[PDB]
Structures are given as structure tokens and as C-alpha cells.
A paper describes a structure:
R.[name] is a restriction DNA glycosylase that recognizes the sequence 5′-[name]-3′ and hydrolyses the N-glycosidic bond of adenine in the recognition sequence. R.[name] from the hyperthermophilic archaeon [name] was the first HALFPIPE superfamily enzyme discovered. R.[name] recognizes the sequence 5′-[name]-3′ of [name] at its electropositive HALFPIPE region and flips adenine and guanine bases in the recognition sequence to outside of the DNA helix using its β8-β9 loop. R.[name] hydrolyses the N-glycosidic bond of the flipped adenine using three catalytic residues (Y68, H211 and D214), Y68 is used to stabilize the catalytic water; H211 is used to localize the position of Y68; and D214 is used to stabilize the oxocarbenium ion intermediate and to deprotonate the catalytic water.
Here, we report the crystal structures of the R.[name]([name]-[name]) mutant in complex with three types of [name]. In this study, we determined the structures of R.[name]([name]-[name]) in complex with [name]([name]-3 bp-[name]), [name]([name]-5 bp-[name]) and [name](nonspecific) at 2.45, 2.20 and 2.75 Å resolutions, respectively. In the R.[name]([name]-[name])–[name]([name]-3 bp-[name]) complex structure, structure models of amino acid residues 224–226 of chains A and B and those of amino acid residues 13–17 of chain B are not included in the final model due to low electron density. Although the DNA sequences used for cocrystallization are not identical, the structures of the R.[name]([name]-[name])-[name] complexes are nearly identical; the maximal root mean square deviation (RMSD) among the complexes was 0.304 Å for 395 superposed Cα atoms in the asymmetric unit (between the [name]([name]-3 bp-[name]) complex and the [name]([name]-5 bp-[name]) complex). Because the side chain of T28 is inserted into the minor groove of [name], the side chain hydroxyl group of T28 forms direct hydrogen bonds with the base and sugar groups of Thy−5 and Gua3′ in the [name]([name]-5 bp-[name]) complex and with base groups of Gua-5 and Gua2′ in the [name]([name]-3 bp-[name]) complex (DNA bases of the symmetrically related molecules are indicated by a prime). In the R.[name]([name]-[name])–[name]([name]-5 bp-[name]) complex and R.[name]([name]-[name])–[name]([name]-3 bp-[name]) complex structures, R.[name] dimers form 31 and 32 hydrogen bonds with the bound [name] structures, respectively. In fact, the roll angle at the base-stacking distorted region is larger in the [name]([name]-3 bp-[name]) complex in which the TpA step (Thy-4 to Ade-3) exists at the distorted region. However, the structures of the R.[name]([name]-[name])-[name]([name]-3 bp-[name]) and R.[name]([name]-[name])-[name]([name]-5 bp-[name]) complexes show that R.[name] does not form any interactions with the R.[name] recognition sequence even if the sequence is located near the HALFPIPE region of the bound R.[name] dimer.
Numbering used by the authors:
A (entry chain B), C (entry chain B): 8 to 12, 18 to 223
B (entry chain A), D (entry chain A): 7 to 223
Amino acid sequence: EASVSIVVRLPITRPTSKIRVKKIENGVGIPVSTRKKSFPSDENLRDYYIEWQISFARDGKYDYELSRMVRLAHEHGILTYNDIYELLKFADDVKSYLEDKGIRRESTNEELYGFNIYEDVYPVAKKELPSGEFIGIVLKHAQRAVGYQSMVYVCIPLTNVEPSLAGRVARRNEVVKYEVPVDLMKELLKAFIIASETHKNDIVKFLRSII
Amino acid sequence: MEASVSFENGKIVVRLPITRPTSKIRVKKIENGVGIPVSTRKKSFPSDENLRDYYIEWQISFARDGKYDYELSRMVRLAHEHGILTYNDIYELLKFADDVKSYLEDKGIRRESTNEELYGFNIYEDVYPVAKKELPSGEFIGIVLKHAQRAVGYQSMVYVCIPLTNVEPSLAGRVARRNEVVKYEVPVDLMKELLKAFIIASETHKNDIVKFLRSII
Amino acid sequence: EASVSIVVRLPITRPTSKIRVKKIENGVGIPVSTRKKSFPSDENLRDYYIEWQISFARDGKYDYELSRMVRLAHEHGILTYNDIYELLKFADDVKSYLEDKGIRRESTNEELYGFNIYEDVYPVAKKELPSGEFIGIVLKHAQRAVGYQSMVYVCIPLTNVEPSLAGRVARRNEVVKYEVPVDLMKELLKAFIIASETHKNDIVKFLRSII
Amino acid sequence: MEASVSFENGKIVVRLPITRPTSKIRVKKIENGVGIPVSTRKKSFPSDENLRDYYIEWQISFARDGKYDYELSRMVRLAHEHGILTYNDIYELLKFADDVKSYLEDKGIRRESTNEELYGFNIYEDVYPVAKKELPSGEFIGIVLKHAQRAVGYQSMVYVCIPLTNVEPSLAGRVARRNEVVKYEVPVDLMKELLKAFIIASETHKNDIVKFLRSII
DNA sequence: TCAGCAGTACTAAGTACTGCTGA
DNA sequence: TCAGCAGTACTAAGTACTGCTGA
């Protein structure tokens, strides 16, 4: 698990967790064995990033990861009253969500040696922030039943993270400190707001709880 | 977990578990055109019509350890050993493999840009290729492409969807038993279409099929 | 580590430790993957055993594994006064040790395609106890400098150990309970006594400390 | 850790670390006929006579991943590529491998019973076979047999012991430097005797040598 | 300094997450 | 029951034990 201080502490040596270090190779993120291969010391270090599938709530109660960040920052004045207003007014005007895009199987007129060829289109929402972080919203078929489930990711470059790991392997159970910018937390909220009405309704009544 | 492969009464038979919903073999139910997972141990199968929408989806593999002693190759070997798959069957399967020049892997995976935005968030569409074929006996065979997670490139995977009416015993109107597996007699034509599926999935898959088929002949 | 209760608690899922489960195969003990292969339910379970390279002292002070067993059993009257006397009188009469046998390289008159062929002989002391346990004393070249180091092993059959693991895989961090017979503890002491004068001198003054 | 293998001035050169006493490459000192480990970073090498008793013992391997791009095969390949190991050298090495009919592995490992007891404890003698050869250039090559720990059977391992006088720089009268590695020019005759050592160690080792030598020729 | 790596080779743990099994 | 396995696929941890490295 990641501990939240505002600041968070993310482990580097758990590629099977929701927090995993990846490296851009041939355009796709691939898992990195941070303990058998030394991190590059040059410009390639920008191609490395931590992928954190961030969650909003736990136990149906609002104090885990993102929800803990946001309210810690209101209690510290980091988020003004009007931050939460315009976050909610933004939610009040949001009609469509990535869930509304859904997952479709489009039929092509192609036949591969007797096999009919189709295409599955998956909708993805992506936003880049000036400091280098990326926010990803992906759609997946609900494993429990009919419908969709939306999931939010935060991609943090290893250059935005200290101690700098250039020219060495990771430490055992290494946990590294990342200062959380203010507008990442609010763009993360907006990410949940535009993911699904289910996510927005929970973000909406969480912001109302402290405003 | 692995499914039992056996020969009985001149038929290749596989025993498919129906109580491991998290495995390569899982019982599903089509609801509005999407296969939904089924908790076969708490909700009872319907005894009425629309039991057809229930099926077994089997993510079948051909190779293991660079060897051909696993699932499909186990079935094909037994079928060859028992005269179920004849010399002419395998010879012409190899001729079909020689003629195949394009593969499902050639379609690739692309991320399309869109004219759409969602409240300041850029919208992309990742399209994935799938190959589907319906057999007259009721089964479906699907080939989906995906990114090779550890390397770069693609890996293709073959699925066979078996309707519950094609397996025994009849599960109509009851909950699956503890550790229950169903008896599925594999038609000869399905084994051919499954071998062909691996042939057109990717060149790497085809040369595995060709090497196994030629070693048996 | 193994906890001592007299009774000890030995972990089953650490093949790289001093405590490892082995199975006799082709006459030699081979490591067992107690989590990927199910233990046999039949007579083959007798071929499985726990190999524990037992230590006598730690921190140069006498209260670790064997030394903790022995004095716990004197304090409980499990070892009489004359047990420790005849253990020491046995030590007082012991002249030779397995270390005195040493490791030799004997030369054969054979030549394998221009290569001279020799034989290294390693001395081993072995004793079987009626309940099935084995005690092994092996000699190894001292890794630190000139000389030898002696090491004592206890081989415990899986049939002498509960819960019975027939027909299943081990539990995670599984620790299993073994009741320690009285004469195993004293034959273990005698094992250290006949291993080397260095080991005997420490056993000797340990027994004198509580007698 | 792995030793650097390179070609320079018509000589195959390996760079051997002398500050990793726990590795496959470790500095030893013979005291009364036994190689004792040396702490090369706290006790200084002698500048006087009896520095010969100090040597580097290298547990050298030929294969890795079923491939021949590791240590000895790296050296032999470079030697072949640079005319250091000629066509006639490799051809007659293969003829030596064809004639070899017995191996060090054939001697086996036995536990002998003894007429001795040690105060109620049974005494056994486990004997292990070792093959040794001294080269005129000063190096020794040893083949020791051991039980294959994970399987059953034996695995043989080749050692090459290099006296410190055969490497540069001269370490007489000083403590090894931090992360220091020494330059060792590999004589052609040693590479042959090391290839022959693997040939007579076991049949499995020989067929690895024969396959690599024939692929190079 | 002096905590922690270097080196070695292999299994078992961590990992996410529900049904489901078992005693 | 209800704690913990079943199933899945991969790296990183545990392991013993000293020299030795590094910041």
C-alpha cells in the first residue's frame, strides 16, 4: 500500500501491485525489473514512469488515496472553497462520461481464411499535465455482470520523483517520495467525474461533505 | 488447473470444469450480446428455453515449454493415435498451412485519435482485431490479439466457446455440483478448425502447428 | 528461525534455510517444492524428511536451539543430574573426533586422457535413532582459514511430525510441531562432543554451568 | 558478476576481478597443500618469494541458456574470429572428442562403509573424483564431480587456477585496489586444454563442445 | 564510517479479487 | 460455517554469510 503524508509514498518493487514502474519501449509501456536491470543515467530515464491505478474510495468511506489527498488539502487551505464549488459546478454541467462510450465490436467485411474479422474499440480518456504526469481513464467490461467499470491511472515520470534512481537498481521494499501538485489532485477528481455517473455521484457528495 | 483429455468409444473427450470461474475454462451467459460470467454454484441453470445462451468458453493453448504435450496437442496426438484424425486429414491441413500468407497478427493494435473530447480530456480509441467462426455443431472459435506484455509485439490466443447443450450431463434446472466437470465429446471437424485457427493466428503459431503435424506424419 | 517450546516449531516453506524438507530419491536427498507438488499419501511419505542443520550456541552464549533445549530439560527434571555427568564422563573419555579424520585427496594411478585422477574422501558420522530420526556429522574445509569446521544435522521424517501433510501442499509460512525425544537431545550433544575438541570444550563447560 | 573477455594485440584477454572472494573468481593461497581464501583488501600481497602460492581460481563455464555466448565460448569464438584458434586446431579438437569414450562423470560418487566407529556413531567415507592437469605455462585445470542438487545424477565443473605471476599488473607488496581486476592474456594452449577438459568431464559437456566447435567450422 | 550491497542459485512470497472449497 | 484456497503469471523476496563497497 501507498502511504499519504501533501505527499505520497509509492513502492517501486511491486510490479504485480496497482503501483508499478514501467518504461516506454516501442511506444507501449512494458514492466521493468527494477532489481535486475540498472536504470539509465541519460535521457532514457524520461521513458520510465510509475503507473498507479489510483482508487477514490475504500470501505464505501472517503479516506483512501485520492479521497484522503483532497480533504487533507481542503483542511490545509490548499483547496479553496471555490475550488470545490467549480469542481462541483463542473460536475453539475458534465453530461457524458467515458462509460457512455462503451465497448463496441465493429464488423469489417474481411474474412481470414473462412474466419470473420471484427474490431473491438476501447474508449480511453487521456490528459497530460505541464509537469509531465499523465492521467488515464480506461473502460473495461464489468467482471461482475452487465455494464462497464471505469478505472483511473496516474503515470508519474521517474524524473519527477526522488531519490533519483539513475545508474542503479532499486532498493528492497524501496518506497520513493513524490510531491503531489495541487491541480493533479483536482484533475484526478475531474477524471473520476467524467468516468461514470456512478463515480461522479460519489465525488459529488464527497465534495459536499466538507464544503 | 488443466482439463482432462482422454479417448473413449472412438471419440476424443475433454472433461471441462464448470466451478472455476477464474480459470481458462469458465461458464458464461450471453446477455444482450456480451458473455457474462455465471456463478454456477449459487444460481441454478434454467430448465426452460434460453439455456442456449449459456456456454463454456475455453482459452485453449497448443504448446507448453516449447513442447506439444498440452491441451490441443494432447487431443490431436490421441486423435492421430486412434485413427480419428487420418493421414489425409493431416496432410491437407499442412497444405492449408502452406497456402496461408496473412495472419490475424498482421492486423495489429492501433490507438486512433478522435475528433472528440470529454471536458478537457483527450479521447482515443484503441481498436483490437478478433477472428470468429461458427461451426455447424454449435461451437464458436475466436482468435483475439493482444500486446505481449513482457516483450514488444503481439501474442494471439484461441478461444473455443462450447454451448452447454453440447456437453453432458444435462445441467438444466439445477446448480452445478462441487468440483463438477462436464463430459465434452470433441468432433473431428472442431479439431481441424482449431488447428486451422492457430495456423492463421500468427506465423509463430503456424510453424508450431506445422512442426507438430509433420512430426506426427 | 525455529521457535522452541519440550517442543520445537520448524518451518516447512524455506528450502534455502538451515531447515529444509527433502525426499529420498535414488538414495540421495533432493529438495522438495512443498508448494507446487502434493505430498504422497502412501508409503512414499516415509522417504520425505526435514533436514535441520542444528546449531549449538549463538552470540557465544548458551541459549539457542540445542543449548536452549538441553537446559530447559534439566530445569524441568527431564535430564537427571547423572544424565549430565555421564554426558560429561563420556566427553572426558572421548579422544578422537570427526575433525581428526580430516579431508584427504588420495591419488589413483589413473590418467583420463592426460589428466591425473584423484579422489577426495570426506568423513561423515551418522547415527539412527529407533524413532526414525538421523543425526549427521559432516566435515568441511574451514572457509575462513586453515583447518576444518564440523556441522551437525538432524533428519526428521515427515511421519514423525504433525499436522500430517499426506495428500496436500504445504501452507504459507507453514510451521509444524515436532515433539523432541529425550535421547535425541543427548545424542545431539554427543554429536557435538565427537565433532571437534572445539565443539566438545563448549559442550563440556555448558553442561558444567547447570550441573 | 562476469569477467570481461576481449581481444587485444592478437591475444585473447580476460579481466578477472580480485575483490569478489565469494564469486566464481576468487583469489586463494596454498597453505600446506590447501587453497585458503585471501582477503586481498586488508592483507597486502607479499613482495618476496612465496608469492607463487597465491593464485586465482576461476570456476569457468562453457554454456548458458543452452547457448554458447558465455565465458569459454566467448573466448573460443573470439579466438576463432581472430585467427588465434586455427581450422586445424578445431578440426583435431573434434577428432579428440570423437575418440574420448570414458569421462570423469563415469567414476561417480560413492559412500564407503568403514570398519571404524566414533563412540557409537557409524563412520562413512564419501569419495569424490577430481581430474587435475598442470600446464607448462603454470596454470592448473581441475574437473570436480558433484551431485546435481535439483535432479539426480552428476554435474561436472571445470576450474582453472591462474598463478598471480601470470597476470598483470604486478600486485607484489601492496593491497588490491577497490574493484580491481587483473589483465590475463590467455595462451592458445590453455583454451585447447580447457575445451578438452569439458570434453572428458561428461558426455553432456562433450556434445556441447562438439556442437559449438562444428558450428564454428 | 557503517549500513547495506556483492555474490551465489533456487523456491516461495507478493500481487488483485471473487467464487468456492473443505474440514 | 468461514478461514483460506483456486486460479492466473510474473518479478522480487527469502536464504546464509563474510568481505567489501559507497556516499
